[PDB]
């Protein structure tokens, strides 16, 4: 019963900030790492970063 | 072939002895309620050892089938068994001789002790 | 020719297996009649004798990343910490609205939230209450989500906070492990062993030496030292790894202190219950700190870099300070004197290296905390009474827990990591494997059995 | 001399059999967490008895070294062993013949049952 | 007759050996405090097996009385025992020879291993 | 209630009201009971 | 709740079979078993 749930978002003006999130279950939250990735229509895939929910620290692509 | 227990069971003695190694071996295979799992396992072990020790006391520790020198008599059960040995079979037999097990075991102990004394005297005279 | 089957019993053959290991302890008892220590370690058979047998011509594979005993060390440590609070007073009656003005604070380190924090407590007869106050350290006090004059204990609206009994204060006790009959523990006598592959010097013991249940992040302290040079242990599948373990062959002494002097006070709760908190503080104010020798710190890191580049044999090495997270993962955490310290180590890892003793003391600044959400669990917070007077503490530094990150260029970037208590225990249990013995087997022989 | 377990271990079979009595004897030497101490001890006992019973089933209950009448053959492992018996040694041997233990044990049971029948007929004819 | 334990006890060795089967058999006959009942039962079983295994190591697994080939000597206890065998008796005997049990057992192991080797060579030459 | 404790209870009810109920097929209910009666009378072999 | 010091007026829906009139004014009610026994709730994780 592993599931991930995401909320939607609006269109922002340039210079603005956005907050997005993801809820997950079916596995202990603090027992694994989570990744965020990005892709735009017509483009390939990029990796953005990793967060360790156990603690914790982060690491990001430059 | 795993026959579990009591596979034969309905057979003649003939015939039934063919599986003595099956029942002999399947006998050793074994939150606070778990205390009972340990108690059950301890009981299985203690019961096994008591029977194994008794065969040793009678001189039959190494065998499933053992022949001794206590004579059979008519003060016990009364069957000629020329056919009945191979037609009765085991449950009925124990019921027929149920009043003598406490007697026969006593004879088996006496016979083995006498033989042990005889062996010691014969070796001493070597 | 004319071979027949013969059977042997007592053959020296073994297989890897998962089992239950038992603790063993030292000759001296705790002697406090404490169920989580005296009845847990002091009543354990003592002084097992490690009469190691060295085996000629035996080769065996030792995997220190994956084994069946690190997890047991983890469970034993958790069990003790849960049991230690079993008979101790809960602080539920204390989770009341606090009125802490810090009107009498004499320092910026105090006035943030510590002095005369008051409360209304009902005691001892249920019928009457009195106004009491005490000193609490600021990291454990939070503003009530209302008027700024009102305060709450940091964890009391979500979990239970309990205090500790003086008798259960727990310092390290080395725990030795022993195998049950039918099992044996093998050691790998290889001074250059990195945690994987075969060892050509195999020996067995009836017990391991003792390992202390010490918990820290970033730095490994009080442990054994490497026999040769610094050994860096890592995984060898992908380079995307979680932990790099650096084991030093020389210790670095670290001296820490809490220079002020505290008065202990006590607020009664009831019939055998009292809350311990800080009273008058003596007498001037100095921050907690730790001292490190400069030449040893720099030499040690240069030597670590020299070996670290073996795993990354290309461009240079850069170290960086903590990037974020809660305090246990960003500061150096330890419990000297029974109080918990959170030292800022960000000044210590700003060095860069490139291809081609008691002097100039390096000092760092430390903070302390009383309510600890321990590494072992959530929902059950432990409090801690203040220790009266000042605190002094000396220990030895034996290793580092490092992780990796992205640099701004083509060089490698490393920084302190931690929180995985298993990586502390895995740094000492790397030498042991447990196997089972299966003594029955067959072989051919020039022998037949007589029928007669 | 207490050699513990697996003392030799690196030796030839020669040679290795010299310590069968060591490993045979060191095998019997053994707050709610204490429930595990009892569980571990029960397991050690049950495992010992299962092997001891099996030697009894095969007719070798009294010996560390036992010779029987099941012939060796080439459908099993394939080594002449004139040198290899004393140069292999035990761990490697079990791996080489790891696919036959479930076969050989079956032969040992059959051989012992046949001998027991033969003994009973010979005694009956006395 | 249930004599329990230590029935004789005050008797000569003669004479005392007549009840070896009594003490051998009465030895196997066995809210959180109940954990101790299981611990006591486990200890009784482990101790029994250790002694039974040792008799097996010495070649006496099937007997209460067993004769072997380790010679008696004077470096041990010093009694002629022509009368004293049947006049001492057991408690006093163990005290008199209490300093040698750790020696005699070592001799018994060596003797049995030599006999086992001799049997294997004789069968191999068949 | 407190630090890890809460009481669960009903809030707003949607949206019209119907009673709870259960549905049984008629012919099966009647056939089944007729067959039970046929066997039940074996223990009571007399009147209806 | 949650700090011992303060209380609030709350309400909820309960089914009628579990609510009894207080043996006093008819406007006052009590939980059906709470004057004689302990009533506990169940954890979502132990629904069986
Ligand atoms: C499984 C594997 O890739 N093994 C290699 C090993 O041969 C090499 O010595 C080590 C250091 O580069 O890295 C790893
Ligand atoms: C050489 C070294 O590591 N230094 C010592 C270690 O001997 C002693 O353990 C410890 C106090 O435990 O002080 C430090």
Numbering used by the authors:
A (entry chain C): 1 to 52, 52A, 53 to 61
B (entry chain F), D (entry chain Z), E (entry chain J): 518 to 548, 570 to 664
C (entry chain A): 32 to 147, 157 to 309, 312 to 321, 321A, 322 to 359, 361 to 398, 409 to 504
F (entry chain E): 309, 312 to 321, 321A, 322 to 357
G (entry chain E): 163 to 210
The paper states:
The trimeric HIV-1 envelope glycoprotein (Env) spikes that mediate virus entry into cells are vulnerable to at least six distinct epitope classes of broadly neutralizing antibodies (bnAbs), where each bnAb class is a major focus for vaccine design. CH235 and its more mature lineage member, CH235.12, utilize VH1-46, neutralize 18% and 90%, respectively, of a multi-clade panel of 199 Env-pseudotyped viruses, and do not require insertions or deletions for this neutralizing activity. The inferred unmutated common ancestor (UCA) of the CH235/CH235.12 lineage, referred to here as CH235 UCA2, exhibits micromolar affinity binding and weak neutralizing activity against an early autologous CH505 Env that differs from the transmitted-founder (TF) Env by a single N279K change, suggesting that this variant (also called M5) initiated the lineage. Here we used virus neutralization to identify two point mutations and a modified glycan profile that together render HIV-1 CH505 Env-pseudotyped virus highly susceptible to neutralization by a germline-reverted form of the CH235 lineage of CD4 binding site (CD4bs) bnAbs.
To understand the structural basis for CH235 UCA2 recognition of Env with the N279K and G458Y mutations, we determined the structure of CH235 UCA2 in complex with Man5-enriched stabilized CH505TF.N279K.G458Y.SOSIP.664 by cryogenic electron microscopy (cryo-EM). 3D refinement of the ab initio model against the cleaned-up stack of particles, without applying symmetry, confirmed three Fabs bound to the HIV-1 Env, following which 3-fold symmetry was applied to obtain the final reconstruction which refined to an overall resolution of 4.2 Å. The CH235 UCA2 Fab bound at the CD4 binding site, approaching each protomer at an angle similar to what was previously observed for structures of other CH235 lineage antibodies bound to monomeric gp120. The CH235 UCA2 Fab used its CDR H2 to mediate key contacts with the gp120 CD4 binding loop, exhibiting the CD4 mimicry that is typical of the VRC01 and CH235/8ANC131 classes of CD4bs antibodies derived from the VH1-2 and VH1-46 heavy chain germline genes, respectively. The CH235 UCA2 also made extensive contacts with loop D and loop V5, which are the sites of the N279K and the G458Y mutations, respectively. The side chain of gp120 K279 adopted an extended conformation that allowed it to stack against the side chain of N93 in the CH235 UCA2 CDR L3 and form a van der Waals contact with the side chain of gp120 F353. The CH235 UCA2 CDR L3 appeared locked in place by its interactions with loop D and loop V5, with UCA W94 sequestered by cation-pi and pi-stacking interactions mediated by loop V5 residues R456 and Y458. Apart from interacting with the CDR L3, the side chain of the engineered gp120 Y458 also stacked against the CDR H2 of CH235 UCA2. A change in conformation was observed in loop V5 to accommodate the bulky tyrosine side chain from the G458Y substitution.
